[PDB]
Design an enzyme around this catalytic site. Structure first.
Site, short mmCIF file in Angstrom:
data_model
loop_
_atom_site.label_atom_id
_atom_site.label_comp_id
_atom_site.label_asym_id
_atom_site.label_seq_id
_atom_site.Cartn_x
_atom_site.Cartn_y
_atom_site.Cartn_z
CB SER B 1 -0.58 -0.52 1.31
OG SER B 1 -2.12 -0.97 1.31
CG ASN B 2 2.24 3.22 -2.55
OD1 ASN B 2 3.06 2.91 -2.16
ND2 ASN B 2 1.67 3.11 -4.21
CG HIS B 23 -1.02 -1.58 -3.05
ND1 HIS B 23 0.75 -0.68 -3.33
CD2 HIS B 23 -0.88 -0.61 -3.83
CE1 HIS B 23 0.74 -0.36 -3.39
NE2 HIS B 23 0.24 0.05 -3.89
CG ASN B 269 3.46 -1.63 2.56
OD1 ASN B 269 3.17 -1.66 1.55
ND2 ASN B 269 2.37 -1.30 3.54
NE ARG B 297 5.59 -1.03 -3.13
CZ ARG B 297 4.73 -0.89 -1.69
NH1 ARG B 297 4.15 -0.37 -1.44
NH2 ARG B 297 5.14 -1.79 -1.06
#
Ligand SMILES: *[B-](O)(O)CCCCCC
Lengths: 164, 548
Positions: B1-2, B23, B269, B297
């Protein structure tokens, strides 16, 4: 008096639920989600109840890719009646009302469904749900960051024999 | 996830802003579902939730938007048991032999004959919790066994917690509500409000060990392998109690990482450490947060967020829709130099051309260079000391970087890794002229829909996870509910999609409608006000009731 909800859908089937209390709010949420995903919730509730082997046998898997029998063993252990009761007793009145409402709303859709948006009508596992079922799903979600990751490992845990 | 929250000091409008990009699976018990909930006068929240939950998990209200990412904190501990030398079904605590509790569960199993047979299974339990076995790692022999204590088993506050969040007014109120209840199970919380505050919270349910106990209670070998393993033969290694904690044995809110700023905060994350590198978060228990090198990321995000220029909503949106494979930034330049040093190696010809034509993205029209790059990176990660600049803890945002081609051993293996990767790709049934979109799809009925995005381990902010099925890659998880919230004067302007659509049922009109839009990366309005909702030509309404 007592369960009532006003629902508006915008584009792409996004529900907008209005109610005067948590009970009515849950009622709308349960009905709306059922219209879109009754079969999905029914399957996952079967999993959280540890009844996958009962409906589908031992050759199949859950949506989390666990063998049906190990998954059933894990969730039967996780969601024992004593555990569910303690969780329920620890819930606020507001949360209890949300859950009661949700269950009633979901069940109302099931009663009236004619297959228009539901592909699993007539299946024995597609049935009325209870607040306990929602507790089973909640607890399943809870352990995802812990013992749930060790479901197979828990099932495999057996004392040694007379070896070596 | 962001997740990215932007404050008044960095936003183009001087107000708060939040990008939510979790995500999650595209099927099953964690499939997001959009909804808007209102109890006039005291509740008005919109966002997405998980199956069975009558609360909004990620969303926004009048003055506030919030989201979550899976944290790096531990939410359980393994306990190595010292078994009774006379009885492997008994274990020692303070030198005293205790019996394992046995709980039998009965399961009904359907045979092909359709008859139900009953299977009984014994679950062995210690004072810490159930025993677990990983064959070859965590065994149950006559010397030792392992039990697991999950902290969230006692978290009866999870639903009330999100319901409280749904009622939060602003960032400060959200923080009070989360710290007071400590009901968040295993995620970070990021938020932004209209006033322009950006918040990061590592406020979850985390096992508590007083700092002085850690070096004595940890199992060194196992914690070095990333496992929260403790000594289960010492009563002093039980989770510490602090009356301030909402739950016995968990970490008090005051000891968990929080960052409240007016520039920005982010998380993809990694730990709480470099949420904003201008104000690094340090000095926490290793159960809570460690100073580990961040993934690509986060490194990508920070490279787009660092600086002085105002951030626009469009800027955040395009951080997702660009589908930039950020890991190519670190290795592809030097990899192309290698390809230039080895022209006419024939085996490398197709790969070096594909890598050279490649747009360094994971778009629908992206070339096969992405595929070659993925297979290569899977081998490059198994090489030892091949970075030109290895991880520098003084430069955690710019390292690692480059391939050490000036070392002949490294140059040997990198070329081998490329030839191997090339070989694997040619072996597979990939046609010429095949673009990434032709490969990665989401099946809807008897048809496919091309899905943009790639694996997050390659630094694709729009993380998409797929598995090989037949002739294609079938998406199983990744970018799901997208929510980008700004706060103009009229009210919350919310923009995004639910990538896999509202309904998992093929019969529904909302089975693939948003999925078609995700393929084309065309995000939509998330209508919140009565005026936005009334302005929708697809507006439908139903009032239902029944006796309680
Ligand atoms: B992401 O891949 O860390 C998953 C985040 C899901 C948030 C649930 C509320």
């Amino acid at each position: 008096t007592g369960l009532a909800a006003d629902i508006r859908w915008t584009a792409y089937g996004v529900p907008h639920i209005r109610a005067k209390d948590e009970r009515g709010l849950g009622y709308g949420i349960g009905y709306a989600y059922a219209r879109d995903n009754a079969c999905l919730l029914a399957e996952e509730i079967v999993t959280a109840r540890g009844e996958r082997a009962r409906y589908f046998g031992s050759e199949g898997k859950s949506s989390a890719e666990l063998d049906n029998l190990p998954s059933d063993i894990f969730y039967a252990w996780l969601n024992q009646p004593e555990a569910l009761q303690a969780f329920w007793q620890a819930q606020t009145p507001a949360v209890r009302q949300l859950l009661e409402g949700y269950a009633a709303g979901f069940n109302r859709f099931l009663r009236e469904a004619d297959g228009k948006t539901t592909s699993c009508l007539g299946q024995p596992w597609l049935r009325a749900i209870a607040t306990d079922d929602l507790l089973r799903l909640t607890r399943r979600l809870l352990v995802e960051g812990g013992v749930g990751q060790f479901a197979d490992a828990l099932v495999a845990a057996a004392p040694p024999g007379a070896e070596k | 996830s962001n997740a990215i929250a932007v404050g008044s000091e960095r936003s183009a409008d001087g107000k708060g802003m939040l990008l939510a990009n979790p995500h999650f699976p595209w099927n099953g018990a964690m499939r997001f579902y959009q909804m808007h909930l209102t109890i006039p006068g005291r509740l008005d929240v919109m966002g997405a939730s998980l199956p069975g939950l009558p609360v909004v998990n990620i969303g926004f209200s009048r003055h506030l938007a919030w989201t979550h990412t899976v944290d790096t904190s531990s939410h359980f501990t393994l306990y190595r048991l010292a078994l009774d030398p006379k009885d492997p079904r008994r274990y020692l605590v303070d030198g005293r032999s205790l019996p394992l509790e046995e709980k039998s569960v009965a399961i009904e199993v359907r045979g092909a004959d359709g008859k139900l047979s009953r299977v009984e299974h014994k679950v062995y339990q210690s004072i810490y919790g159930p025993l677990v076995v990983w064959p070859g790692k965590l065994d149950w022999n006559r010397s030792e066994a392992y039990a697991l204590r999950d902290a969230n088993l006692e978290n009866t506050r999870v639903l009330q917690q999100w319901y409280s969040i749904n009622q939060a007014s602003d960032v400060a109120d959200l923080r009070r509500r989360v710290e007071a209840l400590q009901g968040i199970p295993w995620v970070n919380t990021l938020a932004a409000d209209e006033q322009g505050n950006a918040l990061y919270m590592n406020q979850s349910v985390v096992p508590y060990l007083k700092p002085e106990l850690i070096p004595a209670c940890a199992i060194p070998q196992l914690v070095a392998e990333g496992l929260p393993a403790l000594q289960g033969q010492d009563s002093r290694c039980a989770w510490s109690r602090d009356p301030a904690a909402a739950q016995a044995g968990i970490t008090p809110a005051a000891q968990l990482p929080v960052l409240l700023r007016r520039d920005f905060v982010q998380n993809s994350n990694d730990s709480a450490w470099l949420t904003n590198p201008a104000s690094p978060l340090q000095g926490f228990s290793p159960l809570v947060s460690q100073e580990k090198p961040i993934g690509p990321r986060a490194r990508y995000a920070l490279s787009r967020l660092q600086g002085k220029q105002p951030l626009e909503a469009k800027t955040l949106e395009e951080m997702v829709t660009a589908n930039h494979v950020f890991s190519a930034d670190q290795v592809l330049p030097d990899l192309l130099r290698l390809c230039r040093d080895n022209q006419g190696e024939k085996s490398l010809a197709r790969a070096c051309a594909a890598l050279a034509q490649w747009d360094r993205g994971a778009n629908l029209d992206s070339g096969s260079g992405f595929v070659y790059f993925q297979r290569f990176m899977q081998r490059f990660a198994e090489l030892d000391g091949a970075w030109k600049e290895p991880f520098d803890a003084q430069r955690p945002l710019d390292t690692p970087q480059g391939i050490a081609l000036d070392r002949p051993q490294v140059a040997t293996q990198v070329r081998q890794a490329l030839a191997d990767a090339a070989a694997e790709v040619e072996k597979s049934g990939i046609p010429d002229g095949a673009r990434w979109g032709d490969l990665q799809v989401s099946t809807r009925g008897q048809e496919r829909i091309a899905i943009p995005g790639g694996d997050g381990h390659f630094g694709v902010y729009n993380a998409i996870q797929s598995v090989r099925k037949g002739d294609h890659l079938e998406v199983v998880g990744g970018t799901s509910y997208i929510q980008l919230v700004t706060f103009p004067e009229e009210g919350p302007k919310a923009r995004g999609l639910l990538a896999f659509s509202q309904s998992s049922d093929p019969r529904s009109p909302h089975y693939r409608d948003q999925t078609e839009l995700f393929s084309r990366q065309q995000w939509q309005t998330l209508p919140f006000s009565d005026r936005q909702i009334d302005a929708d030509p697809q507006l439908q309404r139903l009032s239902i009731r029944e006796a309680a």
